[PDB]
């Protein structure tokens, strides 16, 4: 006769709950699979891609259970602009008796270390093999800056295809190709509509998709039939995630850095402002741990245009007040995840889409901002994301001087002007600043049909730097 809350609390207290991370553990013995890390912070960022109106957030809600906050009363229904973040924990059943496909289970991040197996008749306890962060990239043909920023954030991929619709969806191919542009190859194929398909039709669809992914760089892409609605074949997805995708190399031997992709202002209205919190920049940490209380600087920061039209860039210095990596504030941070670094930054810097795709460095390092950038660029044969009713899918042309091109340098979305074009290299003038740390893998999109269409990939080889003014 126990209530649901009482049963949940009993399972939580049986399983150990969520132990607090040690304040200053020995970081030379701390792998991404340690209990202090695995139980309370993500180490792998896996992201979902698919064409418009497919249920990209619904599949992640099925896997994890946490909503992406599809906001704005107009993005409620059609498309989101900002990404959809989600946390799920991969738990395997320790008893060999239960079937291997059903051994795995993705739960919410509120779960404990050892939850009991919900399978009827199984007394085993679940072991957390990994907790993974989820990134959802909107797939609309005007909003591609967010998808490329996410791809720069990405570490693992999940591609989605609809059944009853046409096999060659341009947007799914665009997402795939953009993923292989960003040095990403762990891609898993997901067919969502199997419930509304027949025995034979899904076979021709899978044949067409197999023929589709034959010449692209990624070859070993497993295919998973899922249901965002019937909520089945989820444990198989988790098993494939754990097996096929290992951890990209990441340790604590590299200097810290941050790539802020979202802006979040903690301004709970109605209450007195005598009790407020810090302004939070949501960013991916691709390298370098952070600990509770640090001095950091957003390198692009203040961008002003003086009385001559010249650009002045002041890094935004800030002391880190909190690190909302997970539901409870953590003492440290782990590379390869999304963390909300809450500093003393004024919340209006985080109110709107302002801290979108910017680069941030800890004190003791000086990431260099650049105004003119030398770029080595390679291009694809034909445009992608365009539907052609049977006539020679449009071929990507060559660049021309003095034109605006959306140059997504990792997360930074800039409209660059091409000063010169060579056989493989070009010079870009940026009206919006970008800072070059190591390589910052670039993607390029050209305005050919009104909206942007991706063209190819690029790498920074040189640049013309600007000195920050403290």
């Amino acid at each position: 006769g126990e209530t649901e809350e009482e049963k949940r609390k009993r399972e939580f207290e049986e399983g150990g709950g969520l132990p607090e991370q040690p304040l200053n553990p020995d970081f030379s013995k701390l792998n991404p699979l340690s209990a202090e890390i695995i139980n309370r912070q993500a180490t792998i960022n896996i992201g979902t891609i698919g064409h418009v109106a497919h249920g990209k957030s619904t599949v992640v809600r099925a896997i994890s259970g946490v909503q992406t906050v599809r906001f704005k009363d107009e993005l409620e229904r059609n498309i989101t602009i900002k990404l959809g973040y989600a946390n799920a924990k991969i738990y395997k059943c320790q008893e060999p008796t239960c079937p291997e496909p059903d051994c795995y289970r993705s739960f919410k991040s509120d779960k404990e270390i050892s939850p009991k197996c919900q399978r009827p008749g199984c007394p085993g306890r679940y072991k957390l093999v990994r907790h993974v962060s989820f990134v959802d990239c909107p797939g609309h043909d005007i909003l591609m800056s967010t998808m490329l920023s996410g791809a720069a954030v990405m570490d693992a991929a999940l591609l989605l295809i609809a059944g009853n619709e046409s096999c060659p969806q341009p947007q799914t191919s665009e997402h795939l190709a953009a993923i292989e542009i960003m040095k990403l190859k762990h891609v898993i194929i997901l067919q969502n509509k199997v419930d509304l398909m027949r025995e034979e039709s899904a076979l021709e669809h899978q044949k067409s998709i197999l023929k589709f992914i034959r010449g692209t760089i990624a070859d070993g892409a497993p295919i998973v039939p899922i249901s965002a609605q019937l909520k089945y074949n989820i444990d198989a997805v988790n098993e494939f995630i754990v097996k096929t995708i290992p951890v990209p190399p990441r340790d604590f031997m590299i200097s810290p850095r941050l790539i802020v992709i979202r802006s979040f202002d903690v301004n709970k209205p109605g209450a007195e402002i005598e009790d407020l919190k810090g302004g939070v920049a949501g960013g991916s940490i691709l390298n370098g741990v952070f600990k509770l209380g640090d001095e950091i600087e957003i390198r692009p920061g203040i961008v002003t245009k003086d009385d001559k039209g010249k650009i002045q860039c002041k890094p935004i210095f800030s002391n880190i007040v909190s690190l909302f990596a997970e539901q409870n504030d953590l003492k440290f941070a782990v590379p390869g995840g999304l963390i909300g670094v809450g500093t003393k930054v004024d919340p209006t810097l985080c109110r709107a889409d302002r801290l979108v795709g910017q680069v941030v460095g800890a004190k003791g390092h000086l990431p260099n901002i650049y105004t003119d950038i030398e770029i080595n660029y390679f291009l694809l044969r034909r445009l992608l994301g365009v539907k052609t009713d049977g006539q020679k899918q449009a071929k990507v042309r060559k660049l021309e001087p003095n034109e605006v091109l959306m140059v997504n340098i990792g997360s930074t979305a800039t409209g660059a002007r091409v000063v010169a074009v060579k056989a493989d290299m070009a010079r870009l003038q940026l009206t919006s600043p970008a800072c070059t740390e190591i390589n910052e893998k670039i993607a390029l999109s050209r305005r050919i049909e009104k909206h942007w269409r991706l063209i190819g990939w690029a790498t920074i080889k040189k640049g013309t730097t600007l000195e920050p003014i403290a």
Binding site: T58, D195, Q206, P222, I223, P225, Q229, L230, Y232
Partner: protein, 134 residues
């Protein structure tokens, strides 16, 4: 490799055949009583029941479509106008296509809810989040 994909396809087809042996043609013929100047629908209760829709939402939809303000008697929708049966049939079909049945699946199992304050349709067999409010 697509070999371990057909096994999960077959398992999913098995679970569908176990769970949904049915997989609407459950639209009652609309009965429109013409009484001089008055147009009566003594069957709108059955329309609401068979379409799994609350009556007042259906009335709101009808009077957002048509330019009238009519009353309800206890179970029956009575209005004062000269309205044909074809119009009632077509508004029922439009309500079915845009509200009642899923626009991505063949299902009526959705019902009416309010997610910040707007009507946000949610299903029961599939549970997909799609919403139409006009």
């Amino acid at each position: 490799v697509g070999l371990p994909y057909s096994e999960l396809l077959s398992r999913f087809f098995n679970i569908l055949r176990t769970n949904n042996p049915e997989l609407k043609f459950r639209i009652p013929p609309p009965v429109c009583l013409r009484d001089g100047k008055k147009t009566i629908f003594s069957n709108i209760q059955d329309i609401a029941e068979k379409l799994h829709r609350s009556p007042e939402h259906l009335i709101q939809y009808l009077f957002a479509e048509l330019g009238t303000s009519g009353s309800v008697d206890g179970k029956r929708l009575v209005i004062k106008g000269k309205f044909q049966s074809k119009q009632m049939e077509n508004v029922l079909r439009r309500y079915i296509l845009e509200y009642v049945t899923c626009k991505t699946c063949k299902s009526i199992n959705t019902e009416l809810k309010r997610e910040n304050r707007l009507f946000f349709m949610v299903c029961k067999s599939c549970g997909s989040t799609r919403s139409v409010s006009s």
